[PDB]
Design an enzyme around this catalytic site. Sequence first.
Site, PDB file in Angstrom:
ATOM      1  N   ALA B  72       0.820  -1.205   0.000  1.00 14.15           N
ATOM      2  CA  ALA B  72       0.000   0.000   0.000  1.00 14.15           C
ATOM      3  C   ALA B  72       0.856   1.258   0.000  1.00 14.15           C
ATOM      4  O   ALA B  72       0.410   2.313  -0.469  1.00 14.15           O
ATOM      5  CB  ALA B  72      -0.932  -0.004   1.207  1.00 14.15           C
ATOM      6  N   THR B  73       2.080   1.165   0.527  1.00 10.80           N
ATOM      7  CA  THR B  73       3.013   2.282   0.439  1.00 10.80           C
ATOM      8  C   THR B  73       3.310   2.623  -1.016  1.00 10.80           C
ATOM      9  O   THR B  73       3.328   3.802  -1.395  1.00 10.80           O
ATOM     10  CB  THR B  73       4.301   1.947   1.196  1.00 10.80           C
ATOM     11  OG1 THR B  73       4.013   1.792   2.592  1.00 10.80           O
ATOM     12  CG2 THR B  73       5.336   3.049   1.016  1.00 10.80           C
ATOM     13  N   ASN B 154      -5.796   3.769  11.433  1.00  7.38           N
ATOM     14  CA  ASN B 154      -5.156   2.567  11.955  1.00  7.38           C
ATOM     15  C   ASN B 154      -4.873   2.634  13.449  1.00  7.38           C
ATOM     16  O   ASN B 154      -4.635   1.589  14.064  1.00  7.38           O
ATOM     17  CB  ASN B 154      -3.846   2.295  11.208  1.00  7.38           C
ATOM     18  CG  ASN B 154      -2.851   3.431  11.339  1.00  7.38           C
ATOM     19  OD1 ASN B 154      -3.216   4.602  11.257  1.00  7.38           O
ATOM     20  ND2 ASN B 154      -1.583   3.088  11.542  1.00  7.38           N
ATOM     21  N   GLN B 182      -7.246   0.021   6.095  1.00  5.23           N
ATOM     22  CA  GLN B 182      -7.978  -0.306   7.309  1.00  5.23           C
ATOM     23  C   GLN B 182      -9.446  -0.612   7.048  1.00  5.23           C
ATOM     24  O   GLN B 182     -10.184  -0.884   8.000  1.00  5.23           O
ATOM     25  CB  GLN B 182      -7.859   0.834   8.323  1.00  5.23           C
ATOM     26  CG  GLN B 182      -6.445   1.050   8.844  1.00  5.23           C
ATOM     27  CD  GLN B 182      -5.901  -0.157   9.587  1.00  5.23           C
ATOM     28  OE1 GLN B 182      -6.640  -0.872  10.265  1.00  5.23           O
ATOM     29  NE2 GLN B 182      -4.601  -0.394   9.454  1.00  5.23           N
ATOM     30  N   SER B 202      -3.740  -3.232   1.165  1.00  4.65           N
ATOM     31  CA  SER B 202      -2.583  -4.071   1.451  1.00  4.65           C
ATOM     32  C   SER B 202      -3.061  -5.423   1.952  1.00  4.65           C
ATOM     33  O   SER B 202      -3.863  -5.489   2.888  1.00  4.65           O
ATOM     34  CB  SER B 202      -1.670  -3.415   2.491  1.00  4.65           C
ATOM     35  OG  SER B 202      -0.440  -4.110   2.604  1.00  4.65           O
ATOM     36  N   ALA B 203      -2.547  -6.496   1.342  1.00  2.00           N
ATOM     37  CA  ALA B 203      -3.110  -7.826   1.560  1.00  2.00           C
ATOM     38  C   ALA B 203      -2.879  -8.321   2.981  1.00  2.00           C
ATOM     39  O   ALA B 203      -3.755  -8.968   3.566  1.00  2.00           O
ATOM     40  CB  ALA B 203      -2.520  -8.817   0.558  1.00  2.00           C
ATOM     41  N   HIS B 204      -1.719  -8.021   3.558  1.00  2.00           N
ATOM     42  CA  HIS B 204      -1.339  -8.579   4.855  1.00  2.00           C
ATOM     43  C   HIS B 204      -2.079  -7.940   6.030  1.00  2.00           C
ATOM     44  O   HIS B 204      -1.726  -8.160   7.190  1.00  2.00           O
ATOM     45  CB  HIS B 204       0.170  -8.443   5.057  1.00  2.00           C
ATOM     46  CG  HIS B 204       0.618  -7.045   5.343  1.00  2.00           C
ATOM     47  ND1 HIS B 204       0.787  -6.564   6.622  1.00  2.00           N
ATOM     48  CD2 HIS B 204       0.931  -6.023   4.511  1.00  2.00           C
ATOM     49  CE1 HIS B 204       1.190  -5.306   6.568  1.00  2.00           C
ATOM     50  NE2 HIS B 204       1.283  -4.953   5.299  1.00  2.00           N
ATOM     51  N   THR B 240       7.833  -8.186 -12.896  1.00  2.00           N
ATOM     52  CA  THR B 240       7.244  -9.520 -12.938  1.00  2.00           C
ATOM     53  C   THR B 240       6.195  -9.684 -11.845  1.00  2.00           C
ATOM     54  O   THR B 240       6.363  -9.206 -10.720  1.00  2.00           O
ATOM     55  CB  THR B 240       8.328 -10.590 -12.784  1.00  2.00           C
ATOM     56  OG1 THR B 240       9.332 -10.402 -13.788  1.00  2.00           O
ATOM     57  CG2 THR B 240       7.743 -11.986 -12.932  1.00  2.00           C
ATOM     58  N   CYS B 327      -4.532  13.051  22.445  1.00  2.00           N
ATOM     59  CA  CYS B 327      -4.344  14.248  23.249  1.00  2.00           C
ATOM     60  C   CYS B 327      -5.558  14.457  24.144  1.00  2.00           C
ATOM     61  O   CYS B 327      -6.625  13.879  23.927  1.00  2.00           O
ATOM     62  CB  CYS B 327      -4.113  15.488  22.372  1.00  2.00           C
ATOM     63  SG  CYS B 327      -5.616  16.349  21.866  1.00  2.00           S
TER      64      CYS B 327
END
Lengths: 388, 386
Positions: B72-73, B154, B182, B202-204, B240, B327
Amino acid sequence: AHMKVYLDNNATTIVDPEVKAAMDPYFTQIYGNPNSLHDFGTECHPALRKAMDQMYEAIGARDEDDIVVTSCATESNNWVLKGVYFDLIKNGDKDHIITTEVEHPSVTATCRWLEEQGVRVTYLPVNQDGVVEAHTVRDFITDKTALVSIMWANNETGAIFPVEEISEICKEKGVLFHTDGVQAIGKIPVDVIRAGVDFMSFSAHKFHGPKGVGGLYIRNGHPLTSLLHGGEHMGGRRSGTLNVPGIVGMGKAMELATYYLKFEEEHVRKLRDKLEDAILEIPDTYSVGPRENRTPNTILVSVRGVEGEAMLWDLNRAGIAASTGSACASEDLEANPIMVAVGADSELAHTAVRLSLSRFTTEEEIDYTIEQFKKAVERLRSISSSYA
Amino acid sequence: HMKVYLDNNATTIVDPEVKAAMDPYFTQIYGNPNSLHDFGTECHPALRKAMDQMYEAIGARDEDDIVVTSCATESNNWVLKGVYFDLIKNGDKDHIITTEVEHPSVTATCRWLEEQGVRVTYLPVNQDGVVEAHTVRDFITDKTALVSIMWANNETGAIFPVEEISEICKEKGVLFHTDGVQAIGKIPVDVIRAGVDFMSFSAHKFHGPKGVGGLYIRNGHPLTSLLHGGEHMGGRRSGTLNVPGIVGMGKAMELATYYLKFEEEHVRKLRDKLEDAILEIPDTYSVGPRENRTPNTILVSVRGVEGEAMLWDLNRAGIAASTGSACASEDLEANPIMVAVGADSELAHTAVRLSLSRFTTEEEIDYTIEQFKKAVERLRSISSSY
């Protein structure tokens, strides 16, 4: 007539069962994020440390140097090219990049886009031996050349480039040197200090590692603007959660490649030479590139009467996996017809059959490939009126 | 003693079914999908099914594009830098709107773009830990190129009003990107109902393998490639294909939508049990409203104790959790509350983040409650004013 035989190893390789076994725990058994502080995350830290150590030892890098794990060699090439463009061209006093006509698309298309950004690029054409010589690039470096990017070994012909001499020439002119070394790991000795390179790209799935993981070597931690920004992964040089299985398997595969290098130079070379001599026994066949400067696992054969793609299809129908390679016609010094490497974008290019072995290729596979190659050549020459 | 993983917002375990679906594509099926021989094409039906699962899980249409990235980055870097290149460097725009609570892949990318002359307004976050649509509507100019707002946070688990922001963004004719990492597996994801132009995932984070992510593009909208080269992924992202990554990602996304449609009550009940039990401790505050929170996230601030020390003492007990910036403030009745804040603020203190998954057991929750109470009492006896 059907036996499945893989001779397209320059495109990708089978994952060594030892590599897959080394990777296995890091999906479900050990899954924590390495950047977390709890024991779940830190459990994988020794594996990453050992894998990075394996990478450093396999290419002979030093401790001051950096090896950043990317997702693929395409990422590494894009990163190096665009980063030197950003550092020395957009925010510097340079505007020139020197490269070859035979680079991987990850380099050539990036250079074309950079040309769309005002960058001067000279795509150096390749000589009869299928390599670029050091005096030519020396002739083409000016006081505005920012980077020289030349592949270590070619993926179509297997010809090895004189990386050390090019590095010497680059050091004299004070210009950075990047090499696309994907075709070097596991096939030729790789010492990034003897090669004198500032950057090296490599991809794990070309030496029996998993797909989806690659690496970029940087000399002395040289500054290079990140392609992926974010957290401080890989020393803040490439953000994104670490591909833990990819890194572990890459380290294991690189260790195995350096060990099997002598196997690849003795036995794999014997099998490659057997197949190539047998193929060259056919009339009007030409092996592209001199063998004495070729990686031990690659053959690029041009057949005079047959067309390359029909030959590939006929081979695959016999269960043999091969690929294509661009070649053109020329003469040697004795004025004998030979086939030479050429860029794929040339108008004088025709497709030759590329056969690439690995440490897993057997002599049974090679004999079967010889027989089926002869059969297919005879069959496709038998159907044409133009062949004499 | 029991080892308990409650840091699923950071990463998740690979579902055994996902790993089993991935297994053949390392050694048994290893050909390059871009090759023409049978070895390369052997994996094509698996890739086709995986891409179809990905399209179905987020509700994308056939005209839309789903480009498989490495993480995702990569997707966030690609969207931000590509819209900067297309509409800012070679266009008439110079403004990007985002929040102060985005992932570092967004925040640091926007900081670099600021180093490139781009004007960025990092929108502050409200009491509910979210950014409202009228604020961004007020902040769009005629030179704003892109609005990038995460789908769900997150640290707090707060869900953003993505559809309303999409409507306002469409009114102004400005592209909308969301970081939906998320969102997958925790909330319903319909990128057409959400009205987004781009989505990162993101898969993980939904029990897929690490090293594979994706970028959703609406209607195949033009976006300059971050990775150039061959015509992988329709010529939008070279390199690839991570064949095992793609197959496992499809399997994990299908399973995530399945457990969202049925097994959401179980994870939500476990989160509610844990949160009620923890809030029984005096002077504890759960950050963010539960009715706008992902079913798996709790972010608790303990008084007198420090978030990192609480995290450490939990880890000694075998419980894995993380931190989140918060905060101090008051509500409208002038009652003490802890609210979300950017990590770079000087009024921020660290609260403990506990994030469950569909693999969490109620026994783990009972053990975690007991050990949390024990740790609170133990660390309060030695710290600050308690």
